[PDB]
Amino acid sequence: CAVQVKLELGHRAQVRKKPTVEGFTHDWMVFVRGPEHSNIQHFVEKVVFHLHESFPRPKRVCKDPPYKVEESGYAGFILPIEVYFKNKEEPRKVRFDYDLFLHLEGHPPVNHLRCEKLTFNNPTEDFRRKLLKA
Ligand SMILES: O=C(COCc1ccccc1)Nc1ccc(Cl)cc1
Ligand SMILES: [Cl-]
Numbered sequence: 001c002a003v004q005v006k007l008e009l010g011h012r013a014q015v016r017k018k019p020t021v022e023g024f025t026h027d028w029m030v031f032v033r034g035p036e037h038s039n040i041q042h043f044v045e046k047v048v049f050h051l052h053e054s055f056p057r058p059k060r061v062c063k064d065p066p067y068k069v070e071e072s073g074y075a076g077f078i079l080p081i082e083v084y085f086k087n088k089e090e091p092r093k094v095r096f097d098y099d100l101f102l103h104l105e106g107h108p109p110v111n112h113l114r115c116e117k118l119t120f121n122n123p124t125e126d127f128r129r130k131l132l133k134a
Pocket of ligand 2: 095096097098
């Protein structure tokens, strides 16, 4: 009995009115969530955001919702996101490579969204029950 669930990944980015002391020009926030009123905490163990190496503590871990990271910076980068599942079976996690892009000053703030389909073929009963609760 295969089960399909939905994950939304996205981010916002806005030019700061005043650069930070480091000269960072943008504030941004990247997130993983369920669509509409879906609570993905039923089947998500943790979300790991792998920031660019220039960031302090580049491995950011959210064990509880909201699964998000808020930061400031000066350039966009590819941000690997690992979503770990509440199971003890294959797969333990899934990985997405998120394009954390920023727009130049003058352009409207970034507000970006993509939606990811996860289909689990033959999950264990306990994991199937969690997936179906989201
Ligand atoms: O945007 C930033 C700012 O982050 C670094 C930081 C240093 C000290 C404190 C906070 C944050 N780095 C960055 C570098 C290369 C690429 Cl390709 C994309 C981004
Ligand atoms: Cl991807």
